[PDB]
Design a protein around this ligand. Structure first.
Ligand SMILES: Nc1ncnc2c1ncn2[C@@H]1O[C@H](COP(=O)(O)OP(=O)(O)O[C@H]2O[C@H](CO)[C@@H](O)[C@H](O)[C@H]2O)[C@@H](O)[C@H]1O
Ligand SMILES: Nc1ncnc2c1ncn2[C@@H]1O[C@H](COP(=O)(O)OP(=O)(O)O)[C@@H](O)[C@H]1O
Ligand SMILES: Nc1ncnc2c1ncn2[C@@H]1O[C@H](COP(=O)(O)OP(=O)(O)O)[C@@H](O)[C@H]1O
Lengths: 433, 432, 426, 434
């Protein structure tokens, strides 16, 4: 428990719109927080939900640019029902026509954040797949009298490079910090993860304590660090966190034990998404009796299946599936899948609306193709973004096993060997990718 | 066009949710009729409450002879203007005593009287349909009617099952006939062109039926119930015709579109399976502008391990293993086990998920878990909420028994349809 | 520190309505929880607000009969929910009977305990500490206890605790060797010797925290015929050896069940320096319906010791030691002293106005050159010009319904919507 | 008759909340114009948003050159909890921008965002005018006449006319010419027959001119064409772009506006309009209305307390605490605290954002500081006291020398039109005579 309660003492600040290319092309026609997730959600639903389910109701979403789409989702899913909570988007730019780092994004709105009578700021990333009760995270921050509390966990040697690593004393206080080190520096960070609880067998298998990129910073400390101490810092992990320690500030670590995946990259995203189909039980479920992941109420009808053979898959709401075959895939909301289509190890983002039988009549008369997966199509190891018009006989098998290829003009982009059809893209029948 | 004052401030919707629920038994066993599960993700009550909401009518009262915890939670969480239950009896038990619709409305007239409105929109809570009540209420105001009756056109074969009306050339209602036949059916012939129906269909459907939908001016309601007919029990069959008899202004208003009375098991069974109809369903719950609402449950997308789904609809948060599902409707949270074969059935689903912990206790005693057991076979059946059906169960009804009651056993049979009572436990190997 | 959370594990059940014959005629044409209070509130706001500020978001309000007005108030003002539960199907009993009736509904909620709030009382309390004490003592029923001296003590249902605070005996208005036998050591419940000695008696308040299974078992199996909670079920569960603990309540607590006590409590917000009870509070404000009423206007008012509610229209007049309710219109020359003006449910336009005058009627509000002293003016009262309500004869009681008023404890109370013709004197 | 599609899904509201607020300083010192306090219990932004909401317009953007914490909190609590009400700032800092930005530039910069909405027309509203209006009929007219732009028109006499941009129409209500603040001959060449709009003949003769009001309806496409293609360089919306459109033969129609309307964008006008709700007969403008009231944040403040107050021609906000004083022809904002012997005349008291506790007052008294509110024996005359001001005892804000203009920020006040304005949070020590 906490006192004062988190509701009135903790402010949530989500770092969403990274303004990068890591998830390109999923971020080509939309704000990063809006990227579709798990058949029925969007990235931003993960941190907003965890907050709400943690009794945190004052939330700000820091993103690159305003998006009518994003606001509409946030407004309809959260704004409606928070005695004074809120979920507000704070855009960095006045347009999508332009860079900026996390510490820069926070300093920009320091004048607004400091107006809140709160004891701490909860800083979350907007692209991690995980369930966490932030009250225990904050509880640890208050009991250790920490200036900054960094969430951490065991990390293997392969990924250790992509993270900020640390070393803690028996109290969990952070004694040594290093942002994405490598070489001698990376090996020098290897530590005994037995103090974390790891038996011994899997402790030498993960001799690293990696930062999860989320933090609890006491109000005045934040203002102090960003305005006075490091007015020139751009990133938290790379500059603010290391700087705070070097100054001798109380930097505490908090050990997380649940599931946790950063899905900021295409491959990671892809694997995480198909990860909800694994049996007997997936490492992460959006639904939880106690702490479920929320999303926008859509009142879509129950999915229709004409003649479908579905194995190891999850099906979103309001799908219209004909005589087809779906395997080890995630079928997004409002997905239309035609006759003879074959979907394998894929992620179908679905669609934003339904075309009418009349809409589909005009398209044909013009040689265009309807939203959805066309007849006798083969979709394999792909990410089909929203409203994609995939013509008949299209096959996305990437025969040659090409790893990368930027083909925006042809409607796709290949990354890590994954073919991602862009949003609203049309892919003519007969095309083979 | 537009209503002025608007329906939001000048109209009061009053839904006749149901009596003892004698007609949809056992879907109503200890469950108020408005709470009965529908189309995988909804409840009956969602139909009239949605139509009101999409019609800019926000003040809604739901009258029901007995109350129900699920009805209150549903209305509470899904809506509430306001949406409130006005129960005749505050108990979840099925009343063994009779109360007619006129009685139901009479008892709470004093409450509806407290609302400053122009009309009361009276809706039956047993039909499947979509309707924008705005034009309906506008017509009522333009014709200066005291009562406006939604009229459904039909042919000679379907008409003997409704209360018909006879209109003059101005669409004014001048006579009623409750389920007429022979010479009285004929004397009810009407020229349907007068209400807007075209020639071919007018001659094909020369009878107009009331469909439990009415608009009644405030004062008229009070007068009819307290003064004119204080002993009337039935609103539609006694009070409306009574009003016409008094020379009151009762107008017809043509209703055009899909409409099904689903207050009886068989009709309920059919309509529910009608959403799987090919090429397209007669009634869709979803609609771009006027969708049917319900409670946001934040249920996860349905999981299917190895399912063969033919002409069916899958609700939300389902957990389907390897099985065959043909021409069926699968309600929310459903759990189908390995080897199950489901055909021509309506699965209500469940109200919650049994944790692995609960499944342990269950395993400890060898008890049956909620869901469809392994290798079961469900045919032409309705499976109410949280049913605990065991392995190798076979519900196929071989002797084609038509009517039958076996509450004790946990089921009923009406028109060949087997209905597994809610929370019912059907032991392993049982063959029905 | 509650775990699980109160909002998730506690169901609030407020017991109002119930006959309502002491506050007549304020309860004549309305539901009891809806009776106006302190210029801008209603009775029901006190318990609902204390619940909400105590993290208790699931609330049922039990009343005698439905009321669109009360619902409107609760709807517009307040996962969570605040639902009214009517006992009867028309406006034409025991506390446990009231609760029992909806057992079928209460039972369906997955809560550890039910918070029972009964009676009409002014007071701010944090039910979280009360629910904590109940949990820490692994009690079946925790009964809020009010400390008291021997003078008052002999007038209430006293309780006797033990070294552990566990209540072991009850007694309705005891005296002699029996009153002295109830006398306990309040220091045990948390009071300091000083106060504990001044008040060696503890009384029930009508506030209880009952565990879910317990109240279901107590009301359904154990005492299915019990009518009242405190007089039967609570004592009865103790004699059956159930852990019935007591929680010391040490704060403002004023009864407002009678016209005289209701009157004094409302005028009490004008108490010097700091009134005993303030409706506002930085942490636990008393909530109410947002009406978007305009700032109050005063053309020429001499106001002393009084509070003025929202959107009032006041011409030239004197207001003294009074509480002026929302939307209250006061005409020229009016003199108002020691009265509670409850205001109006709406405003009249000059259209409806210059249509009443020309119809021999009276517009809502206090008329020209009126005088109102020691009176309670219910909602929408139409008081004509020159009316004088002084009760010069100091009459104590008078049922003058037909004339739009009633006199109680020397206090004149003008019925809601009543029309007092101009010139009338009282 | 009503709009189809309804305003909610087809109309987008865009409020020009203000620029750097130089004309309303110091009420705009570190406070975007939209957040400026009004009528004891409201803020400027409440007028247009309420007019929108009461017109079935629920998608709303508020443009303001700079941002402010209070503006964000107010909209969040009063409206956030259907469409939205979002602030689109030009600079994400609460500091008053020292650079210029025109209204046309304001909108042009976010046209990409507006364009993302599926609406038919854009309703453009000034954010510093006091008036009540149902935008539905107005929008209805825009659609029936197939107009490209509809401008609400305000009839006025020769005297008042010179301060506004006047318009000339034909005999069918179409606008054919504009004159920005005309005089002499230019003014005379603008006279029109207001009857053409529906005005009364008698009134039409006393008011032969019609001014633009800063209220327009523009078809989505027309908007993009004008600011992107036709006039990519225009800075001012109502003075360059609209006349431009008319110049291009676009269908620019006038829509008569009857009723109360005051521009409260300068100190003097703002001041007069606020004190205008204290008229004995009938206030020309009422924040409250049976059908379309001005909304604001529900604050759950307690009834105002008055110890010994002689109040004449004044309005009193919510949660006030008043002792033995005299309040004449004034507006007293929420949470106001007025001490013993204070005389408040012809003044607008904005109130405070919170209450101080006795604990707080002892600490202030102990350190020789001043508590929020007006002090004992204070004389406040013809003044605007902004939020949380700390006026010490015996302070006299009377302006003995009748100074008309004076800037004295370091002293905590500005004088404009003989109106003293005490700056927000300003501390005016006891005995001080202004
Ligand atoms: N200008 C901007 N405005 C708003 N949002 C922006 C932004 N720039 C980036 N973001 C978002 O905020 C998060 C911040 O992460 P960083 O960009 O600083 O780097 P990194 O992803 O390497 O991770 C970090 O996360 C890992 C764990 O994933 C730690 O180990 C490491 O110490 C830490 O730097 C990203 O997930 C991104 O989506
Ligand atoms: N006591 C009752 N309270 C509320 N609704 C009822 C009651 N009895 C029946 N109903 C509902 O009202 C409808 C029956 O309408 P009614 O006008 O009484 O028919 P009839 O034509 O037989 O008079 C059905 O939708 C039914 O579920
Ligand atoms: N940069 C700006 N952004 C938003 N609104 C502005 C800006 N500058 C001024 N405004 C507001 O818009 C309206 C019009 O400004 P004004 O300077 O008279 O130009 P015009 O009327 O020619 O458009 C006023 O209500 C003003 O406060």
């Amino acid at each position: 428990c906490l006192d004062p309660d988190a509701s009135r003492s903790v402010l949530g600040i989500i770092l969403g719109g990274g303004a990068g290319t890591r998830l390109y092309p999923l971020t080509k026609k939309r704000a990063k927080p809006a990227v579709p997730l798990g058949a029925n959600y969007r990235l931003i639903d993960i941190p907003v939900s965890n907050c709400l389910n943690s009794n945190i109701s004052k939330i700000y979403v820091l993103t690159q640019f305003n998006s009518a789409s994003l606001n509409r989702h946030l407004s309809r899913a959260y704004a409606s029902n928070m005695n004074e909570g809120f979920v507000e988007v704070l855009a960095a730019q006045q347009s999508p026509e332009n860079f900026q780092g996390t510490a820069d994004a926070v300093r920009q709105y320091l004048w607004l954040f400091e107006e809140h009578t709160v004891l701490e700021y909860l800083i979350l990333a907007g692209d991690h797949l995980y369930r966490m009760d932030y009250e225990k995270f904050i509880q640890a921050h208050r009991e250790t009298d920490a200036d900054i509390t960094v969430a951490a966990l065991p990390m293997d040697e392969k990924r250790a490079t992509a993270f900020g690593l640390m070393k803690i004393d028996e109290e969990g206080r952070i004694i040594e910090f290093a942002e994405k080190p490598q070489g001698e520096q990376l090996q020098a960070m290897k530590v005994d993860t037995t103090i974390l609880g790891l038996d011994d067998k899997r402790a030498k298998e993960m001799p690293f304590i990696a930062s999860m990129g989320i933090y609890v910073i006491s109000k005045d400390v934040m203002l102090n660090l960003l305005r006075d101490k490091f007015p020139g810092a751009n990133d938290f992990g790379s500059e603010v966190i290391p700087g705070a320690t070097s100054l001798g500030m109380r930097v505490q670590a908090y050990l997380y034990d649940g599931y946790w995946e950063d899905i900021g990259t295409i491959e990671a995203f892809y694997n995480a998404n198909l990860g909800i189909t694994k049996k007997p039980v997936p490492d992460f479920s959006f639904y939880d009796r106690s702490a479920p992941i929320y999303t926008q109420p859509r009142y879509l009808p129950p999915s229709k299946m004409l003649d479908a053979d579905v194995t190891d898959s999850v099906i979103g709401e309001g799908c219209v599936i004909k005589n087809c075959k779906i395997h080890h895939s995630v079928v997004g909301l409002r997905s239309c899948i035609s006759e003879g289509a074959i979907i394998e190890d894929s992620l179908l983002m679905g669609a934003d609306y339904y075309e009418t039988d009349a809409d589909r009549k005009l398209l044909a008369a013009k040689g265009s193709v309807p939203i959805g997966i066309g007849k006798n199509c083969h979709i394999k190891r792909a990410i089909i973004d929203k409203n994609a018009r995939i013509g008949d006989n299209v096959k996305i098998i990437n025969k040659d096993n090409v790893q990368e290829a930027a083909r925006e003009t042809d409607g796709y982009f290949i990354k890590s060997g994954i073919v991602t059809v862009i949003k609203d893209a049309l892919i003519p029948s007969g095309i083979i990718i």
